Amino acid sequence: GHMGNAAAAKKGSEQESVKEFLAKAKEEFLKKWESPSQNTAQLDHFDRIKTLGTGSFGRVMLVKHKETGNHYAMKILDKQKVVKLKQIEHTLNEKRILQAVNFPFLVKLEFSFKDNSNLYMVMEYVPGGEMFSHLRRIGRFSEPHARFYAAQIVLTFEYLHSLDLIYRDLKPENLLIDQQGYIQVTDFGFAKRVKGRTWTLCGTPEYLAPEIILSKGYNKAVDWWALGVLIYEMAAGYPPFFADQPIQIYEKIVSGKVRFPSHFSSDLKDLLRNLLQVDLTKRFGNLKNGVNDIKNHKWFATTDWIAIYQRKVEAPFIPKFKGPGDTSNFDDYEEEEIRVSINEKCGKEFTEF
């Protein structure tokens, strides 16, 4: 067989230990999911420094906690805009998830609170910037560099999926690089507890699985498809399916055809053909052997999964870091005042926040 006695025993034991870890992590998650936290700070506890990123949700700002001096990333959501954009459930769910999960590559929620106008999620500041920026600047990542990041996503999805959480918005834009060069996943607005199937059309066109495009009931296998897209984009510098307009991207995604750069290793192409598999009955991560089909693939043969989890692997790339509160790895955004209001807005809708 492919493994002799010592290697087979070691691999079997490792896989059983993962089961044991995940069972404990599920217990801990469900305890926090049922007995959460709330209203753990207020706005005038922080100095607002600079906008790190924006969206239709609102903005994320670097802030400095006055009493302690620690820097954080504060997501500010305007309640009225959240309601107008029909994102009430997503916003409440994001906070509930962030409050309950615990994993080394999932951003930590340090505080949350609300006022008459806004909702506030105060997360760890992740100073290395978006993977997206580094990828576009460097062009592409080497296969070892891509593999280092990919391994962290595999472990993170193994964790989330054990909790019955589907992530649904993997892309380099949503992956931050911390001071040690490791990944932080931050955005959980589209994540959903799904033990079986779900049906919402959501995600980013280049990263959508065919079964989402085709309006099917779908499951956690869409995250493994998106992993394939991410690995491809990290290693090529561009995603596998692109076009001027989303409908053309969707035609390519559902076609069953993907092309690879000549510099892709055969191991990489084989992994990607098995992740970017249109047929659900054949896609890695969705078979009887689950995540082990991915973790045991030849392209990951050099990956020490425990050492990645323990953050003991030397990262291929360390972002520039001039000190606490250094924002140089983020873009510049027009700064806008955060107006509260003497009148409570949307109190009923956000009672649970």
Binding site: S56, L85, Q87, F132, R136, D169, K171, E173, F190, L201, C202, G203, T204, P205, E206, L208, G237, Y238, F242, A243, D244, R259, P261
Partner: peptide, 19 residues
């Protein structure tokens, strides 16, 4: 090249979700 085709797509910047 495929890279040139990517540039031509105009989708080289940060990509929004469907919503």
């Amino acid at each position: 090249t495929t890279y040139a085709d990517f540039i031509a797509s105009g989708r080289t910047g940060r990509r929004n979700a469907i919503h």
